[PDB]
């Protein structure tokens, strides 16, 4: 979304109340994260707690492993509720953006003020706490959705093009899954048909081998600040933490069937944090429930059985596919009755163009026959 003066005034008015709310949310989220971190350190697997090293097979560069460095706390409901987890995730996003802004301020001293003016004129990178009314929150969510629309198609195209240009599926079912994974949001994708693509891409690229450009695109699509990007293992850590929290919350909800009892607005927010339900679509409860159930089905029974989600790359592609709107087409069909090269009419046809029209026009067969007969006669005369 482009900056505007109205948004600038809105953010300037709510700057200090927003900061105070952010501080209170910081205290609450620190408490929640302390609880979660203590639980992870106490009951976490040895590999997860010790941060086992996984290196790529080509350049031996360490990155988080989905199986080892990600753990789902099935018994987190006892200590932390689902709402607390959602609050922590939202605060993590807001704190990331605020931390980037504060780092810029510290780095550049008082010279960041005009850049702060540019920042406050757009709701893309302002914390949610800066909105003190429903309309402001709606505009902020619209800005976030616009950023997601801007970023997701590039990530999807990167993934699809790289795979399709460097490899092909093994069997027909994998082919169907791959083809149907990247369909536009206007159509509904069956998670059962699409799931095998997760295994296929695990065969091609796991989350531990994700490239830095693809990571940047994914972070853009997840409203995570990317400047300075730095090493791929920082934003990668951010993504891992966010999706680990999301998976914990999803396991809690699935086990306790909280989504059915969840209210309309809370359900919509839950879907939004999963990148499933844009606000501009004005979805109803039926559609939200359908998409949430599809997400759970895509996770698969193995998620509940062992806490192992499918490949994170393919999962991100699947969820972000809902932001891949059909390519826009505006204008009546009658516009196709016009002509594009009228300005060339005055030029006419030169000798070469006239020759080409004569040879390849309706009289082409006659000219070809005459030319071939003449050439044959000349060749016979020569011999």
């Amino acid at each position: 979304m482009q900056g505007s003066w109205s948004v600038l005034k809105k953010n300037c008015s709510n700057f200090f109340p927003g900061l105070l709310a952010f501080a209170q949310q910081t205290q609450e989220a620190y408490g929640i994260w302390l609880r979660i971190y203590n639980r992870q350190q106490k009951y976490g697997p040895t590999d997860f707690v010790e941060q086992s090293e996984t290196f790529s097979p080509d350049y031996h560069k360490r990155f988080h492993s989905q199986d080892k460095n990600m753990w789902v706390d099935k018994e987190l409901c006892t200590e932390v509720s689902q709402k607390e987890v959602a609050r922590l995730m939202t605060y993590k996003l807001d704190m990331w953006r605020m931390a980037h802004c504060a780092g810029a301020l510290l780095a550049t001293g008082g010279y960041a003020i005009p850049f702060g003016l540019f920042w406050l004129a757009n709701d893309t990178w302002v914390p949610s706490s800066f909105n003190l009314t429903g309309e402001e929150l709606r505009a902020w969510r619209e800005a976030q959705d616009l950023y997601r629309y801007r970023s997701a198609p590039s990530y999807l195209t990167d993934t699809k093009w790289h795979f399709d240009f460097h490899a092909y599926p093994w069997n027909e079912t994998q082919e169907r899954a791959w083809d149907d994974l990247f369909e536009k949001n206007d159509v509904r994708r069956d998670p059962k048909v699409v799931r095998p693509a997760a295994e296929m891409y695990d065969g091609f690229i796991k989350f531990e081998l994700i490239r830095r450009k693809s990571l940047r695109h994914l972070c853009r699509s997840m409203n995570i600040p990317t400047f300075p990007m730095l090493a791929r293992l920082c934003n990668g850590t951010r993504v891992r933490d966010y999706w680990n929290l999301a998976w914990c919350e999803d396991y809690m909800v699935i086990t306790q069937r909280l989504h059915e009892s969840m209210t309309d607005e809370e359900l919509y927010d839950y879907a939004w944090r999963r990148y499933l339900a844009p606000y501009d679509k004005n979805l109803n409860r039926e559609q939200l429930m359908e998409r949430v159930e599809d997400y759970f089905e895509f996770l698969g029974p193995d998620f509940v059985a062992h806490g192992k989600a499918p490949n994170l790359v393919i999962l991100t592609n699947y969820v972000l596919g809902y932001y891949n709107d059909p390519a826009y087409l505006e204008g009546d069909i009658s516009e196709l009755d016009k002509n594009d090269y009228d300005h060339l009419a005055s030029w006419g046809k030169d000798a070469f163009l006239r020759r080409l029209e004569f040879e390849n026009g309706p009289l082409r067969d006659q000219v070809e026959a005459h030319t071939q007969r003449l050439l044959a006669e000349r060749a016979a005369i020569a011999k």
């Binding site: 979304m1 482009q2 616009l146 629309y149 801007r150 709107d325 059909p326 390519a327 826009y328 087409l329 505006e330 204008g331 009546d332 069909i333 009658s334 002509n339 594009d340 090269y341 060339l344 009419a345 030029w347 006419g348 046809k349 163009l353 080409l356 029209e357 040879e359 390849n360 026009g361 309706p362 082409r364």
Partner: protein, 87 residues
Amino acid sequence: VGNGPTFSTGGECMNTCDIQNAFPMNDRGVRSSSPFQEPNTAIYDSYLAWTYFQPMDVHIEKLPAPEAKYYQRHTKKPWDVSSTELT
């Protein structure tokens, strides 16, 4: 017929290019220079062979205009600039 250009070919002979299958083949066996169907496509042999399509007056059964609902997609975004506007 007019003197306007057509879909660009880059001086490539579509009967031997690496993406030849993407160009439909007509009855005469000459692959089209464009994704469309061309009846009078030809090949010329200079130092290198090149495919050429000569526009001509041809009538095609025109399906009646559909409704705007079934082909218009109002997904335009502020950053989006059409190819015509870019041109």
